Amino acid sequence: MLLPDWKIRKEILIEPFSEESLQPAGYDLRVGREAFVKGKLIDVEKEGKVVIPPREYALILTLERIKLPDDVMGDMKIRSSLAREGVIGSFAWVDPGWDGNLTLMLYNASNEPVELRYGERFVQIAFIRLEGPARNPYRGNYQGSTRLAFSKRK
Amino acid sequence: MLLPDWKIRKEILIEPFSEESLQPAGYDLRVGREAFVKGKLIDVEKEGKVVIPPREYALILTLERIKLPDDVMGDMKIRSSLAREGVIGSFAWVDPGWDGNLTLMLYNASNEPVELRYGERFVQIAFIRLEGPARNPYRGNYQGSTRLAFSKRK
Amino acid sequence: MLLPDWKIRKEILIEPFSEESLQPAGYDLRVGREAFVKGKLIDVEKEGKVVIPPREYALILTLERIKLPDDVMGDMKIRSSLAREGVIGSFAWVDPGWDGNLTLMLYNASNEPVELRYGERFVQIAFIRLEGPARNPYRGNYQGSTRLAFSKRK
């Protein structure tokens, strides 16, 4: 059961929260201070921007630290306009009880560099309420992340 | 809370509506009259088809004009079979209150051209009810689009 | 309306079920015995693994046979860590009433091979309840699939 815009203000910790980011049933997460492009970490705050080269993917830290209640799933989709620019998001579930800045994979499938300003809206997260609190809210190894978090699989 | 097939007929404006497109909990949007492949706009109605070249993406206008109620989110996924053909969709949220034909990004990640007939089913949109109407239903710059709509970000 | 972890045990047929796969609001489907990489079928059980070459996609059979009730939609997302590794999932809806092992497209958008063990968690499926049973629960040509199922579109 999806949180409308007005329930998102009341019911999702979004820091820092941006009014222009609030969408009818979701929130435009913004480009944060960290990215990972071509094997290199980017200070997107310093550089002012992340540039996703043609046919490369970036890992982009959300500016927003997102804290989910134990009964809410974060469902993320690329901003339409980045899709229209050839960018594919590869997003995971934002598990109930998640707390942290999100590390987001965007793949520039186009032949043109795709540039995002620091603090630019790029992923709309929507919020699905669970039928009741998750028995085991998120306690995975990315919890509390405030930095670009790479794969811990290996 | 997801609309089953029977609630989709009653509760989503789908024009033109196709019975073969109605799925158990979603609707197979079909390939419309416009596409954008390799920097060029395609009259998919005229050509009869869009061909997504190996390792390229296309912007495909939906044949269907979709109008969402203010309490329903459009949640889009590639048809399974296009996924099985190497095609990746990059879809945005279809925001509550959306009205228009959808511009959809499909990336042919395969090495074989992926061809879609005009009017062929290619994206199943599912419909999530919001907990209550969005306070600010969709009023973004793509509203009412009846044509391939490119990125307005810049 | 999303099934929390505890409702997934009670309300989704998952065979074989793995406790480490159960997530706060979803289940980590695991890499099954079949894959399709570079035009070739892989016995992932025999090989012990599937290797997705740089910039290629694989079709991966889920280890789990998943049976959905007629009022539940399967909503699939890549494991976060595979996203962080440059992998893009292209998933369809898991339609209500689905019964079978899922054929999943993962695209390695990275320049490094992405390897998955047989039985390794790779896609978290979440379960959205429909507002009521689908009138026509899934009866498509992939129903009952227990093998990698390719595109039947043509």
XYZ file of N, CA and C in Angstrom, chain A:
462
model
N 0.834 -1.202 0.000
C 0.000 0.000 0.000
C 0.889 1.280 0.000
N 0.819 2.051 -1.097
C 1.806 3.085 -1.419
C 1.565 4.393 -0.666
N 2.636 4.967 -0.114
C 2.539 6.236 0.608
C 2.386 7.383 -0.377
N 1.302 8.158 -0.326
C 1.224 9.368 -1.153
C 2.222 10.400 -0.663
N 2.415 11.439 -1.473
C 3.334 12.507 -1.092
C 3.150 12.942 0.357
N 1.903 13.177 0.774
C 1.690 13.735 2.102
C 2.054 12.751 3.200
N 1.908 11.451 2.948
C 2.305 10.489 3.963
C 3.811 10.290 4.003
N 4.525 10.703 2.951
C 5.976 10.547 2.917
C 6.642 11.540 3.864
N 6.195 12.802 3.839
C 6.646 13.789 4.820
C 6.443 13.261 6.242
N 5.306 12.695 6.517
C 5.074 12.286 7.872
C 5.720 11.014 8.227
N 6.038 10.242 7.230
C 6.420 8.870 7.538
C 7.648 8.374 6.811
N 8.625 9.204 6.510
C 9.904 8.651 6.071
C 10.949 9.641 6.525
N 11.989 9.181 7.208
C 13.078 10.087 7.537
C 13.899 10.363 6.281
N 13.922 11.622 5.853
C 14.610 12.041 4.636
C 15.493 13.234 4.991
N 16.807 13.033 4.985
C 17.727 14.058 5.455
C 18.921 14.178 4.519
N 19.098 15.325 3.850
C 18.214 16.492 3.987
C 16.966 16.425 3.103
N 15.820 16.874 3.594
C 14.607 16.816 2.795
C 14.484 18.037 1.906
N 14.058 17.797 0.673
C 13.898 18.822 -0.344
C 12.460 18.812 -0.842
N 11.814 19.981 -0.811
C 10.419 20.076 -1.235
C 10.269 19.785 -2.719
N 11.235 20.222 -3.531
C 11.157 19.983 -4.967
C 11.339 18.516 -5.290
N 11.892 17.755 -4.357
C 12.052 16.327 -4.535
C 10.776 15.545 -4.241
N 9.811 16.129 -3.547
C 8.627 15.366 -3.179
C 7.711 15.224 -4.387
N 7.421 13.988 -4.744
C 6.623 13.641 -5.898
C 5.298 13.042 -5.449
N 4.308 12.984 -6.337
C 2.959 12.570 -5.919
C 2.913 11.280 -5.126
N 3.812 10.353 -5.391
C 3.830 9.127 -4.622
C 5.255 8.680 -4.417
N 6.168 9.627 -4.295
C 7.555 9.235 -4.137
C 8.406 10.454 -3.884
N 9.703 10.216 -3.776
C 10.648 11.282 -3.496
C 11.863 11.123 -4.400
N 12.257 12.228 -5.035
C 13.421 12.279 -5.917
C 14.676 12.346 -5.065
N 15.276 11.191 -4.802
C 16.584 11.200 -4.179
C 17.537 11.982 -5.056
N 18.498 12.628 -4.422
C 19.376 13.513 -5.153
C 20.794 12.960 -5.148
N 21.585 13.447 -6.101
C 22.975 13.042 -6.232
C 23.749 13.573 -5.035
N 24.434 12.676 -4.326
C 25.133 13.008 -3.103
C 26.562 13.405 -3.367
N 27.395 13.262 -2.337
C 28.761 13.772 -2.373
C 29.782 12.764 -2.889
N 29.372 11.533 -3.159
C 30.281 10.469 -3.549
C 29.766 9.789 -4.805
N 30.689 9.405 -5.672
C 30.331 8.561 -6.792
C 31.518 7.686 -7.107
N 31.292 6.704 -7.957
C 32.340 5.800 -8.350
C 32.216 5.587 -9.823
N 33.122 6.180 -10.570
C 33.088 6.088 -12.007
C 34.430 5.645 -12.521
N 34.417 4.616 -13.332
C 35.638 4.101 -13.912
C 36.696 3.819 -12.880
N 36.361 2.979 -11.925
C 37.325 2.570 -10.939
C 37.806 3.614 -9.995
N 37.220 4.784 -10.066
C 37.720 5.853 -9.216
C 36.585 6.404 -8.375
N 36.877 6.736 -7.126
C 35.897 7.438 -6.317
C 35.897 8.920 -6.662
N 34.705 9.500 -6.752
C 34.536 10.904 -7.097
C 34.001 11.632 -5.884
N 34.608 12.769 -5.565
C 34.007 13.693 -4.617
C 33.039 14.520 -5.438
N 31.788 14.079 -5.450
C 30.804 14.795 -6.236
C 30.478 16.130 -5.600
N 30.627 16.260 -4.284
C 30.451 17.582 -3.696
C 31.523 18.537 -4.205
N 32.787 18.127 -4.111
C 33.871 18.951 -4.624
C 33.694 19.213 -6.111
N 33.687 18.155 -6.924
C 33.601 18.342 -8.369
C 32.349 19.086 -8.783
N 31.330 19.111 -7.929
C 30.048 19.683 -8.270
C 29.160 18.787 -9.102
N 29.628 17.598 -9.467
C 28.931 16.847 -10.493
C 29.545 15.468 -10.599
N 28.766 14.550 -11.147
C 29.279 13.265 -11.587
C 28.988 13.159 -13.070
N 29.959 12.663 -13.821
C 29.799 12.450 -15.248
C 29.871 10.953 -15.486
N 28.753 10.379 -15.944
C 28.707 8.966 -16.311
C 29.103 8.855 -17.765
N 30.272 8.288 -18.078
C 30.740 8.244 -19.441
C 29.821 7.394 -20.286
N 29.786 7.624 -21.596
C 29.031 6.735 -22.482
C 29.327 5.279 -22.150
N 28.265 4.492 -22.031
C 28.349 3.050 -21.896
C 29.091 2.613 -20.649
N 29.145 3.462 -19.636
C 29.694 3.079 -18.352
C 28.593 3.159 -17.311
N 28.820 2.523 -16.173
C 27.945 2.716 -15.030
C 28.671 3.483 -13.926
N 27.893 4.194 -13.118
C 28.383 4.858 -11.920
C 27.665 4.313 -10.700
N 28.367 4.291 -9.577
C 27.739 4.131 -8.272
C 27.640 5.522 -7.679
N 26.427 5.945 -7.347
C 26.188 7.296 -6.861
C 25.579 7.206 -5.470
N 26.227 7.859 -4.517
C 25.694 7.973 -3.172
C 24.539 8.957 -3.167
N 23.429 8.590 -2.537
C 22.342 9.552 -2.434
C 22.740 10.677 -1.485
N 22.259 11.876 -1.732
C 22.521 12.962 -0.822
C 21.716 12.698 0.400
N 20.570 12.101 0.198
C 19.693 11.905 1.308
C 19.988 10.676 2.090
N 19.924 10.803 3.400
C 20.037 9.636 4.221
C 18.584 9.284 4.370
N 18.260 8.045 4.135
C 16.888 7.574 4.132
C 16.760 6.588 5.277
N 15.747 6.787 6.121
C 15.423 5.849 7.188
C 13.997 5.382 6.962
N 13.843 4.090 6.767
C 12.557 3.455 6.581
C 12.056 2.894 7.893
N 10.755 3.048 8.125
C 10.087 2.268 9.170
C 10.161 0.774 8.884
N 9.877 -0.022 9.915
C 9.985 -1.462 9.738
C 8.887 -2.025 8.869
N 7.878 -1.229 8.533
C 6.768 -1.696 7.722
C 6.710 -1.011 6.363
N 7.828 -0.505 5.863
C 7.830 0.225 4.604
C 9.004 -0.255 3.761
N 8.716 -0.590 2.503
C 9.710 -0.934 1.500
C 9.966 0.255 0.582
N 11.251 0.507 0.295
C 11.679 1.539 -0.636
C 11.824 1.004 -2.049
N 11.031 1.544 -2.971
C 10.950 1.042 -4.339
C 11.415 2.137 -5.288
N 12.569 1.922 -5.899
C 13.323 2.975 -6.545
C 13.249 2.827 -8.053
N 13.065 3.953 -8.730
C 13.097 3.989 -10.176
C 13.821 5.257 -10.597
N 14.541 5.164 -11.709
C 15.261 6.273 -12.325
C 14.271 7.404 -12.574
N 14.729 8.647 -12.496
C 13.905 9.743 -12.971
C 13.639 9.556 -14.454
N 12.389 9.823 -14.862
C 11.979 9.537 -16.233
C 12.958 10.128 -17.203
N 13.412 11.322 -16.908
C 14.230 12.041 -17.856
C 15.601 11.409 -18.027
N 16.135 10.774 -16.977
C 17.386 10.033 -17.129
C 17.175 8.765 -17.946
N 16.045 8.093 -17.753
C 15.670 7.025 -18.669
C 15.652 7.527 -20.115
N 14.999 8.670 -20.354
C 14.942 9.253 -21.691
C 16.315 9.648 -22.198
N 17.307 9.739 -21.316
C 18.665 10.061 -21.727
C 19.522 8.826 -21.951
N 18.942 7.633 -21.865
C 19.680 6.411 -22.069
C 20.240 5.796 -20.812
N 19.851 6.286 -19.642
C 20.405 5.824 -18.377
C 19.511 4.728 -17.834
N 20.118 3.618 -17.426
C 19.413 2.515 -16.792
C 19.828 2.480 -15.345
N 18.850 2.512 -14.449
C 19.128 2.231 -13.061
C 19.116 0.734 -12.800
N 20.012 0.295 -11.931
C 19.984 -1.059 -11.382
C 19.878 -0.901 -9.873
N 18.664 -0.955 -9.365
C 18.440 -0.682 -7.962
C 17.990 -1.936 -7.246
N 18.410 -2.035 -6.000
C 17.902 -3.064 -5.123
C 16.679 -2.556 -4.387
N 16.042 -3.474 -3.677
C 15.066 -3.077 -2.688
C 15.749 -2.258 -1.601
N 15.053 -1.222 -1.137
C 15.428 -0.485 0.063
C 14.656 -1.135 1.199
N 15.312 -2.046 1.918
C 14.602 -2.965 2.799
C 13.967 -2.224 3.973
N 12.858 -2.742 4.509
C 12.253 -2.119 5.689
C 13.263 -1.992 6.817
N 13.222 -0.853 7.504
C 14.175 -0.586 8.553
C 15.512 -0.082 8.071
N 15.677 0.079 6.759
C 16.903 0.637 6.216
C 17.167 1.998 6.829
N 18.435 2.278 7.095
C 18.833 3.612 7.513
C 20.172 3.913 6.873
N 20.218 4.931 6.029
C 21.475 5.295 5.408
C 21.284 6.010 4.088
N 22.405 6.518 3.575
C 22.453 7.014 2.213
C 22.572 5.836 1.267
N 21.867 5.915 0.142
C 21.798 4.801 -0.791
C 22.883 4.917 -1.838
N 23.473 3.771 -2.139
C 24.445 3.677 -3.184
C 23.641 3.197 -4.373
N 23.582 3.966 -5.438
C 22.733 3.677 -6.584
C 23.583 3.462 -7.822
N 23.298 2.382 -8.551
C 23.931 2.128 -9.836
C 23.109 2.726 -10.963
N 23.703 3.649 -11.716
C 23.132 4.128 -12.969
C 24.049 3.736 -14.117
N 23.485 3.116 -15.140
C 24.244 2.754 -16.326
C 23.855 3.700 -17.448
N 24.823 4.461 -17.942
C 24.620 5.260 -19.145
C 24.708 4.317 -20.331
N 23.561 3.863 -20.818
C 23.547 3.039 -22.015
C 23.654 3.862 -23.283
N 23.802 5.171 -23.174
C 23.827 6.000 -24.358
C 25.267 6.183 -24.802
N 25.436 6.904 -25.908
C 26.750 7.198 -26.455
C 27.245 8.578 -26.059
N 26.428 9.346 -25.344
C 26.702 10.679 -24.840
C 26.940 10.635 -23.331
N 27.932 11.362 -22.811
C 28.095 11.431 -21.355
C 26.835 11.967 -20.701
N 26.499 11.387 -19.559
C 25.362 11.834 -18.775
C 25.911 12.430 -17.496
N 25.609 13.701 -17.286
C 26.144 14.494 -16.197
C 25.028 14.787 -15.210
N 25.333 14.670 -13.924
C 24.379 15.009 -12.884
C 25.044 15.960 -11.905
N 24.370 17.068 -11.602
C 24.869 17.992 -10.594
C 24.835 17.320 -9.234
N 25.781 17.689 -8.377
C 25.626 17.387 -6.962
C 24.294 17.964 -6.488
N 23.493 17.127 -5.830
C 22.188 17.551 -5.367
C 21.104 17.534 -6.415
N 21.384 17.028 -7.610
C 20.362 16.915 -8.640
C 19.494 15.687 -8.405
N 18.196 15.836 -8.635
C 17.285 14.710 -8.488
C 17.570 13.668 -9.565
N 17.644 12.397 -9.175
C 17.931 11.382 -10.182
C 17.213 10.060 -9.977
N 16.746 9.742 -8.777
C 16.042 8.490 -8.530
C 14.830 8.802 -7.680
N 13.650 8.432 -8.153
C 12.447 8.582 -7.348
C 12.237 7.289 -6.581
N 12.331 7.368 -5.264
C 11.994 6.240 -4.406
C 10.535 6.367 -3.985
N 9.799 5.273 -4.119
C 8.432 5.159 -3.651
C 8.417 4.211 -2.466
N 7.367 4.313 -1.663
C 7.345 3.680 -0.353
C 6.121 2.785 -0.231
N 6.342 1.471 -0.180
C 5.260 0.499 -0.100
C 5.146 0.062 1.343
N 3.969 0.217 1.935
C 3.797 -0.308 3.271
C 3.645 -1.815 3.220
N 4.337 -2.481 4.131
C 4.161 -3.899 4.376
C 2.826 -4.146 5.069
N 2.323 -5.378 4.946
C 1.075 -5.721 5.624
C 1.208 -5.638 7.139
N 2.430 -5.703 7.639
C 2.736 -5.460 9.022
C 4.240 -5.423 9.119
N 4.755 -4.864 10.200
C 6.205 -4.730 10.349
C 6.934 -6.009 9.981
N 8.054 -5.859 9.281
C 8.907 -7.009 9.025
C 9.322 -7.623 10.349
N 9.270 -8.950 10.425
C 9.741 -9.611 11.636
C 11.192 -9.240 11.911
N 12.025 -9.267 10.875
C 13.449 -8.991 11.007
C 13.740 -7.797 10.109
N 13.529 -6.575 10.599
C 13.809 -5.392 9.778
C 15.286 -5.339 9.419
N 15.623 -4.510 8.433
C 16.922 -4.647 7.786
C 18.070 -4.524 8.775
N 18.929 -5.542 8.775
C 20.129 -5.592 9.592
C 21.309 -6.106 8.780
N 21.317 -5.848 7.476
C 22.406 -6.290 6.630
C 23.626 -5.392 6.719
N 24.698 -5.846 6.074
C 25.998 -5.225 6.288
C 26.112 -3.839 5.681
N 25.096 -3.361 4.956
C 25.071 -1.997 4.442
C 24.288 -1.042 5.335
N 23.635 -1.549 6.384
C 22.856 -0.700 7.280
C 23.695 0.456 7.813
N 23.061 1.614 7.960
C 23.754 2.762 8.490
C 24.748 3.389 7.548
N 24.865 2.899 6.327
C 25.841 3.445 5.405
C 25.633 4.911 5.134
N 26.704 5.672 5.200
C 26.645 7.085 4.936
C 27.660 7.364 3.859
N 28.155 6.306 3.251
C 29.144 6.441 2.219
C 28.863 5.472 1.100
N 29.521 5.689 -0.025
C 29.350 4.778 -1.120
C 29.755 3.459 -0.592
N 28.897 2.494 -0.790
C 29.153 1.209 -0.243
C 29.241 0.244 -1.357
N 30.361 -0.433 -1.422
C 30.570 -1.337 -2.506
C 30.096 -2.718 -2.168
N 30.208 -3.606 -3.132
C 29.756 -4.949 -2.927
C 30.537 -5.644 -1.889
N 29.826 -6.143 -0.941
C 30.390 -6.952 0.133
C 30.218 -8.454 -0.108
N 29.887 -8.872 -1.337
C 29.495 -10.263 -1.592
C 30.651 -11.214 -1.383
N 31.817 -10.816 -1.857
C 32.923 -11.746 -2.016
C 33.426 -12.245 -0.668
